[PDB]
Amino acid sequence: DKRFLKLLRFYILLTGIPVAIGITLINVFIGEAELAEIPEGYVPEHWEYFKHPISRWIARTFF
Amino acid sequence: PKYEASRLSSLPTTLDPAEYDISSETRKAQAERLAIRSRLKREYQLQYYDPSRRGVIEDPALVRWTYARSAFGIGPLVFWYYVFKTDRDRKEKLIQEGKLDRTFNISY
Amino acid sequence: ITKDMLPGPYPKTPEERAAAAKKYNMRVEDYEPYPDDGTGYGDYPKLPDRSQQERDPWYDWDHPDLRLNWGEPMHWDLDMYIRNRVDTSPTPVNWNLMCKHLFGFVAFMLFMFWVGETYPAYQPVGPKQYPYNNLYLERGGDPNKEPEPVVHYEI
Amino acid sequence: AHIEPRYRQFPQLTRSQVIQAEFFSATMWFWILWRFWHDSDAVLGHFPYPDPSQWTDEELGIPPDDE
Amino acid sequence: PLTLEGIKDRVLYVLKLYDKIDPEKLSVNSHFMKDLGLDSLDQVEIIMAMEDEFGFEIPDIDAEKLMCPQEIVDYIADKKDVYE
Amino acid sequence: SWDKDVYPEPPRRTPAPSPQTSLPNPITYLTKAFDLLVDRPVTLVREFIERQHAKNKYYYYHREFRRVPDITECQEKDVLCMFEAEMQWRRDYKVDQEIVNIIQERLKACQQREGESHRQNCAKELEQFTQVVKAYQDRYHDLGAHYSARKCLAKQKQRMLAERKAAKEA
Amino acid sequence: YLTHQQKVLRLYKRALRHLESWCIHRDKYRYFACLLRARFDEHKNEKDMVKATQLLREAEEEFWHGQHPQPYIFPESPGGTSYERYECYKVPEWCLDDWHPSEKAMYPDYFAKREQWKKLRRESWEREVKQLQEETPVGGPRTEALPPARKQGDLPPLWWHIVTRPRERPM
Amino acid sequence: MNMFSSLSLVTLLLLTMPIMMMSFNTYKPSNYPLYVKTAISYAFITSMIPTMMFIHSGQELIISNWHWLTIQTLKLSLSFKMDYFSMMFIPVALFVTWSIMEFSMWYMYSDPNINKFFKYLLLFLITMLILVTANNLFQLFIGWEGVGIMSFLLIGWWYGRADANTAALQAILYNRIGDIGFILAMAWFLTNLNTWDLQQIFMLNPSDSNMPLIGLALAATGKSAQFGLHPWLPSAMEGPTPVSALLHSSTMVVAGIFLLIRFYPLTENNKYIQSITLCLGAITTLFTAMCALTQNDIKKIIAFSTSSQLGLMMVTIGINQPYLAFLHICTHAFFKAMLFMCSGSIIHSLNDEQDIRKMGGLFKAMPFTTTALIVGSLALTGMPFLTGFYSKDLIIEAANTSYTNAWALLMTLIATSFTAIYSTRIIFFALLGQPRFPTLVNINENNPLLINSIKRLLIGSLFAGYIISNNIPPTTIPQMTMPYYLKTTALIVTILGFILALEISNMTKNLKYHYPSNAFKFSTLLGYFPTIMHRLAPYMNLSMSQK
Amino acid sequence: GAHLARRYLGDASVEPDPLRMPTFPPDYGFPERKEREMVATQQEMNDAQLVLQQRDYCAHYLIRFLKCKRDSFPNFLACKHERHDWDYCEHLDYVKRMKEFERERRLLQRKKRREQREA
Amino acid sequence: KMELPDYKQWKIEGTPLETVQEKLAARGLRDPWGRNEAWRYMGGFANNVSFVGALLKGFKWGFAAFVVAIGAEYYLESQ
Ligand SMILES: CCCCCCCCCCCCO[C@@H]1O[C@H](CO)[C@@H](O[C@H]2O[C@H](CO)[C@@H](O)[C@H](O)[C@H]2O)[C@H](O)[C@H]1O
Ligand SMILES: CCCCCCCCCCCCO[C@@H]1O[C@H](CO)[C@@H](O[C@H]2O[C@H](CO)[C@@H](O)[C@H](O)[C@H]2O)[C@H](O)[C@H]1O
Numbered sequence A: 001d002k003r004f005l006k007l008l009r010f011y012i013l014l015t016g017i018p019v020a021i022g023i024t025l026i027n028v029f030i031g032e033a034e035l036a037e038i039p040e041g042y043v044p045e046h047w048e049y050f051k052h053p054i055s056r057w058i059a060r061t062f063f
Numbered sequence B: 001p002k003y004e005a006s007r008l009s010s011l012p013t014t015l016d017p018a019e020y021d022i023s024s025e026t027r028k029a030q031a032e033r034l035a036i037r038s039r040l041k042r043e044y045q046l047q048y049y050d051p052s053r054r055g056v057i058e059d060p061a062l063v064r065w066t067y068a069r070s071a072f073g074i075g076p077l078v079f080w081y082y083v084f085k086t087d088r089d090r091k092e093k094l095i096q097e098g099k100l101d102r103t104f105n106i107s108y
Numbered sequence C: 001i002t003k004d005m006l007p008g009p010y011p012k013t014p015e016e017r018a019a020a021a022k023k024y025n026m027r028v029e030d031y032e033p034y035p036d037d038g039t040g041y042g043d044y045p046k047l048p049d050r051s052q053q054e055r056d057p058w059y060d061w062d063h064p065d066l067r068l069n070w071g072e073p074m075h076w077d078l079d080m081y082i083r084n085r086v087d088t089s090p091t092p093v094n095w096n097l098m099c100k101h102l103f104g105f106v107a108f109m110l111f112m113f114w115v116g117e118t119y120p121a122y123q124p125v126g127p128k129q130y131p132y133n134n135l136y137l138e139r140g141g142d143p144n145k146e147p148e149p150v151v152h153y154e155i
Numbered sequence D: 001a002h003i004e005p006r007y008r009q010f011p012q013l014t015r016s017q018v019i020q021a022e023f024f025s026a027t028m029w030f031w032i033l034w035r036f037w038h039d040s041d042a043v044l045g046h047f048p049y050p051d052p053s054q055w056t057d058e059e060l061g062i063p064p065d066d067e
Numbered sequence E: 001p002l003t004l005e006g007i008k009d010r011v012l013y014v015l016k017l018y019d020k021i022d023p024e025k026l027s028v029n030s031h032f033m034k035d036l037g038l039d040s041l042d043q044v045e046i047i048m049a050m051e052d053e054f055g056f057e058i059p060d061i062d063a064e065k066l067m068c069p070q071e072i073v074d075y076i077a078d079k080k081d082v083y084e
Numbered sequence F: 001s002w003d004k005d006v007y008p009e010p011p012r013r014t015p016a017p018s019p020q021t022s023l024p025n026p027i028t029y030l031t032k033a034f035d036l037l038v039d040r041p042v043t044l045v046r047e048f049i050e051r052q053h054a055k056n057k058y059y060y061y062h063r064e065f066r067r068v069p070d071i072t073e074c075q076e077k078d079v080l081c082m083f084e085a086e087m088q089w090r091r092d093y094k095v096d097q098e099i100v101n102i103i104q105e106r107l108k109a110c111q112q113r114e115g116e117s118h119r120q121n122c123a124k125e126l127e128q129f130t131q132v133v134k135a136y137q138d139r140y141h142d143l144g145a146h147y148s149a150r151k152c153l154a155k156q157k158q159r160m161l162a163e164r165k166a167a168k169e170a
Numbered sequence G: 001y002l003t004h005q006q007k008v009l010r011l012y013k014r015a016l017r018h019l020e021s022w023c024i025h026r027d028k029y030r031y032f033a034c035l036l037r038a039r040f041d042e043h044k045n046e047k048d049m050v051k052a053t054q055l056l057r058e059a060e061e062e063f064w065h066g067q068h069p070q071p072y073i074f075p076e077s078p079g080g081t082s083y084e085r086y087e088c089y090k091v092p093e094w095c096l097d098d099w100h101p102s103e104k105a106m107y108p109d110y111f112a113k114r115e116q117w118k119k120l121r122r123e124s125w126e127r128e129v130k131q132l133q134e135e136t137p138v139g140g141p142r143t144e145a146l147p148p149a150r151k152q153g154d155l156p157p158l159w160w161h162i163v164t165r166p167r168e169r170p171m
Numbered sequence H: 001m002n003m004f005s006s007l008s009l010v011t012l013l014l015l016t017m018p019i020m021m022m023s024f025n026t027y028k029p030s031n032y033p034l035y036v037k038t039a040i041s042y043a044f045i046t047s048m049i050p051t052m053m054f055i056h057s058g059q060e061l062i063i064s065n066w067h068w069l070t071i072q073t074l075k076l077s078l079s080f081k082m083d084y085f086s087m088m089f090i091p092v093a094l095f096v097t098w099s100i101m102e103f104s105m106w107y108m109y110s111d112p113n114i115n116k117f118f119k120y121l122l123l124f125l126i127t128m129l130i131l132v133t134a135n136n137l138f139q140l141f142i143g144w145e146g147v148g149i150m151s152f153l154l155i156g157w158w159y160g161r162a163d164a165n166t167a168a169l170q171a172i173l174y175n176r177i178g179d180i181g182f183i184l185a186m187a188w189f190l191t192n193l194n195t196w197d198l199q200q201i202f203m204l205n206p207s208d209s210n211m212p213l214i215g216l217a218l219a220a221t222g223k224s225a226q227f228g229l230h231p232w233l234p235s236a237m238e239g240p241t242p243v244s245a246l247l248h249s250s251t252m253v254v255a256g257i258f259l260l261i262r263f264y265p266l267t268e269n270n271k272y273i274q275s276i277t278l279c280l281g282a283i284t285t286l287f288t289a290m291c292a293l294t295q296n297d298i299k300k301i302i303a304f305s306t307s308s309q310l311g312l313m314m315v316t317i318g319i320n321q322p323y324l325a326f327l328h329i330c331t332h333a334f335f336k337a338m339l340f341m342c343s344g345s346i347i348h349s350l351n352d353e354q355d356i357r358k359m360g361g362l363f364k365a366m367p368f369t370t371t372a373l374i375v376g377s378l379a380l381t382g383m384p385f386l387t388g389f390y391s392k393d394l395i396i397e398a399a400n401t402s403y404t405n406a407w408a409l410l411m412t413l414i415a416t417s418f419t420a421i422y423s424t425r426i427i428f429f430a431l432l433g434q435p436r437f438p439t440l441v442n443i444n445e446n447n448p449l450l451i452n453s454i455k456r457l458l459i460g461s462l463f464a465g466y467i468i469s470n471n472i473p474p475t476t477i478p479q480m481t482m483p484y485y486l487k488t489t490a491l492i493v494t495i496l497g498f499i500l501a502l503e504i505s506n507m508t509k510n511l512k513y514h515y516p517s518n519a520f521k522f523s524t525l526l527g528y529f530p531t532i533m534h535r536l537a538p539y540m541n542l543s544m545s546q547k
Numbered sequence I: 001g002a003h004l005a006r007r008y009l010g011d012a013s014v015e016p017d018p019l020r021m022p023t024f025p026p027d028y029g030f031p032e033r034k035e036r037e038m039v040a041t042q043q044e045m046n047d048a049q050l051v052l053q054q055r056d057y058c059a060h061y062l063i064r065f066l067k068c069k070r071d072s073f074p075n076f077l078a079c080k081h082e083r084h085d086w087d088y089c090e091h092l093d094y095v096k097r098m099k100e101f102e103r104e105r106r107l108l109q110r111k112k113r114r115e116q117r118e119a
Numbered sequence J: 001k002m003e004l005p006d007y008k009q010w011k012i013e014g015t016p017l018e019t020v021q022e023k024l025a026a027r028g029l030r031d032p033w034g035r036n037e038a039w040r041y042m043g044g045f046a047n048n049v050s051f052v053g054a055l056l057k058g059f060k061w062g063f064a065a066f067v068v069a070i071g072a073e074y075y076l077e078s079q
């Protein structure tokens, strides 16, 4: 029983820690987009209608 | 004051007249019942105490029980049909004459 | 286990009774099937309708928490009669007297509460008085509609 | 084990438990007496209760029968 | 924490406070009915006095068989997992 | 930080302290400890983070959906026009849900803010909530899970015919 | 199932215990307990066994009227407040066979002695089974009483689960 | 505002940390129970700062920090109501739990699952604070059902014992029947109003509130063990003594009353609901006080004492004094928790003996347990100026002078006399007389964990009622004018109860035979309700289920 | 109290009905009755956020007490006199309601006497 | 490991168990278990307070402190 819980902990933290650190670094040094009025004559990409950098990356890369 | 038994309250064994009226026939029956139980106890113990046994001691009595166990009606349906139909008829009629109060009712 | 050792149809002739009784590890005198109605008991024995709590707790049962011995026939409703569920043990007070006393108490209380509502206690005082037309605006009254004033005097 | 058990005899006690038990039983009574000395009204009553039958008819505005 | 000697002392102690027993004929091997001349009604009370002494019940089926102080000591020692 | 017109708040009026005691107020000394120990270090960390966000400034936009013809202008069984009208109606349905949510939050904030005087001081918020809920109910209530612009339009026409019939009755 | 004597003695104990529940105080219980004994001593030498049974039957009816609705129960007796309290803590000894060897290595002396008992169990089994065969009448046992070991070096038949049962306070 | 809100939430977050660090993150199994006790101790201090700010200026907050889900026109957010009731109850609950945890470190010392026990106690507390700070019905329902599940896990702590499992399942059964009313209220508010938020419910202030309030009353009946759904609370004594102390004081049992207090803005205007809650409380307080008169298990007597007090709180709801009902919750927590810890002190010293007929002669043998028991008993019986007098005495005056059901008023006064009798009963048979316990004397209460935990509650049972009543702002107009015979009724009927009880308890020493009357048997067997109902209904349901 | 024995056991016709009363004009037998003066204004009670049931003819004393209780924190014993002024004002208020009950009672008795006299 | 007190101390004389023996003697009976209960009425357990005495535990010192406190307070009234 203790071996399983150590393994469960290890494999969640194996990617959970890099993801936790990655999210903090993105939030600190990249930050969130700031809302702005669509400048006249400009056509934003579909991924420019979202705020968080990870959300924009998900939209651009996959959707 | 005499004890009166019920489905959910059995007669105390000390107040049962039979437990004092004992006969050779009754003792003989008790002895036969003890012999049956002792035979089963010995059969169980010879497996239970076996050093080399690992597993479950299958009890045919348990198997017989589950096999037998695993082997009104519309009245409730009719009753509820008329409770809900009668309730929904009344409510529907009120809604159509504006009597029912649905001032803030916008979630459904 | 074999079909001969499993439960069967309702026994007809006495010879099937003897075979059924030996199958269930009972003596022929004790064996008694359920009524041959339409339920579907078969030849499964009808045993006393007693909870497992009534069995002797000091005996060395093969199943102490169930108070059952290995190989002993199980009551049809054993799962209803386990010690966690329906108890049928003798009670110091007769069952019928318990019911009458309990119902009599609840009925009397419900009656007296009805009487207490119809003749309520209260102190010898007039209604509590509030200013500004019984707080018409504070209670949410319409400010555009003029309220018919309420007046309170000294005494 | 500070306290050895005893057979058929009154148990062994510590000084601390007896003193502390006496301190808080005396604290309870000081508090009760101190409060009663200052807030006896909370037990007996805060204001006089009038005798309504002693009020005059003039002060209740009860007109005389023949009027 | 009971011990075999501790149980034995207390079992004999309780019998030495029973007026129907002479505390000079009393040994661990004295038979309540053959050596001390006591009744079966007396033996029931002795067993009840042991139940009070140690704070647990000795079932009637087992109680009937305890007919000397040593048998009582053995029963209590066996029940409580005392081994010295 | 947010539009004060969409989520209004009346001007705040905190009374100045008027201590009529000589014992110190522990809550003033805990406020200074809070500002010294909790607020200032938190503010410093945030100021560092905001400096990084200033170095890299990029923008996102609020999507604007141009208006397309309503379901009333669609020919029967014309899926291409019906599709655009239906999708627009669904967008408007979702926006109206958030309009009711805005008005409900105004009402709830007023209740907490006005305290014991809320029954009198939140009359405007209650009235506005009452009206918008009525309008929302008229548009969307009783349509069912398989709601559509068609079923909404059919509900509107039933209501319009009843109103026209009631106008004649008067 | 129970002799007349056993029923008189079981009533005597049960009557005294319920009397204790009423009296509570020890001096009061001692007084009434002696009166109760004097009632059992009045008919001790009843010879007519029809009379004796009638006396017992009435005694049990009187007991039912006079019993305490909430008699005292020893805490670990059936129906007591500590009954089966520690059953969750009793782990069968066969569970130790499944310990990881790293768990076993923390108790080398214990698990060495445990092997000796397992050996003693294995070597005795055949003789225990043989003893029960040659002492059991044809048709199987009539009672559940088990025999002792009759030779030297033999162990009483079916001893394992009695000797190695969990302690009453296993933790 | 920034310090008020931050400290309110850190009180809750601080309590989840010992649960969070159970996932191997510097977790010291060495003394996990001490770690959990320290967290309760620090949470109490941080919760005192927002409470002080509320005592000062009446500052109140709603924190809706996280938006969880939006169902069309129904926004659900994690929202906390840091108000009057939250600000006063949280410090009281944490103070009592702090003592119960320190008591448990000594009481559950030998238990091999001591760590799991403290985890469950901590979860019990967290789920209760979710209940009392909840600002919407869905969030309240999380705490409502969370405390019920933790009761099941803690009542059935000794899971090898069949009666423990039966009692644990019984608690779930009765509480889930009350939860029918809870979901009824949730369904009505959503449909008729458009919300589960307390703010919008009180702003719309519906007039036809019979159905939602009946549902809420049904939920309170199950959770606070009012008559009809009451048997589960005495059966909850199967759990270890620390569970009963926490269950019966600052958790579970008072959640039912607390729910009705939170909805006083609705019940204020529904006289029909006030009548129902009044009558329900009156029969509960009288019936359970009668059962306690003949119980012999020291924990069952205190369990029936709680039901009787819960009935008094329900009466206070029915006379439209929600703030006095809340005050009784707070005061009752101090001495009811102390009484259970004193009983556990006795039970431990007599090797798990719980029958008072086997106690006696403990007055001098356990001087500190004796002092706390007498103080606790006097607080419970409304001794002037102890913690219980500052709520119970006001409640009786308020009921005496209210436009009220007369029979309900009478049943409540009789139950006050019965409180003195079964309190006298514990003191007489436990502390006085001669030792009736076995001969090997292991009486010992000289453990610092035992003394300190009881001591803090003893101080609470002396001054908490006075301190609290002198800090809370007035929200009603107390009735202070009444005849002398209405002003002193509580004191008189309590004194007559002591006089009557002493006469009866002294009759037991006479050398006279004792026969049972029908009334005695009725009280001993709890009015027969468990016997008839817990055999009939299980039989009827189970027997039809198979066929 | 005794007054309940009269209404429920004796003659209820001469006993006030708590829900209905007053059943006589406020000026009957009262030449020129002064109105009750309200000291606190509606805005003051609104701004003080008094509970609605507290916004009675004694509210100005409560407002005074609540202000003192706020200015004396942490001294939770510093406003006894102000608390008492509010308590006494409510006592006077209650006595007024006790007089209203007594006045209605005597008037009902007076009405009874006349009816007999007219009979 | 534990020495039991001598068993000859336990006598029913001077305890209410003596009263019981006298009452039975009038009926011709006798109590053989009396000495087994005698420890409950002797030496340490012999005297216990009444119910009133239990309630008034600490009253003497609580009242003495109270008198001092109201003396100390009334003095400051003159000052
Ligand atoms: C949890 C692990 C998940 C891993 C996957 C997520 C990691 C990917 C993070 C990528 C985020 C980058 O986000 C990106 O930031 C840069 C910062 O200038 C922006 O940059 C863009 O906008 C402005 C003007 O156009 C300028 O900065 C720059 O000229 C342009 O390239 C992008 O508009 C934005 O999309
Ligand atoms: C839940 C996690 C799911 C795991 C998914 C498994 C991996 C799948 C990888 C799919 C990669 C598809 O990506 C392919 O190239 C880029 C991104 O790479 C995307 O194409 C888009 O991104 C590029 C990036 O410069 C931009 O020019 C422009 O926004 C567009 O061309 C498209 O999505 C697809 O053309």
Ligand SMILES: CCCCCCCCCCCCO[C@@H]1O[C@H](CO)[C@@H](O[C@H]2O[C@H](CO)[C@@H](O)[C@H](O)[C@H]2O)[C@H](O)[C@H]1O
Residues within 6 Å of the ligand: C096, C097, C100, C101, C104, C105, C106, C108
């Ligand atoms: C706050 C005050 C509370 C007071 C509560 C009073 C009401 C509750 C008690 C009602 C008792 C009614 O009891 C009803 O009549 C008698 C006893 O009375 C019972 O029946 C039997 O009772 C006793 C005992 O056997 C016999 O003497 C009687 O001859 C017989 O009729 C019935 O089974 C029951 O229907």
Ligand SMILES: *C(=O)CCCCCCCCCCCCC
Residues within 6 Å of the ligand: C112, C115, C116, C117, C119, C121, C122, C123, H400, H401, H406, H407, H409, H410, H486, I001, I002, I004
């Ligand atoms: C007089 O001042 C009113 C208050 C006195 C309380 C009355 C006591 C209870 C009456 C019981 C009668 C039962 C009839 C329902």
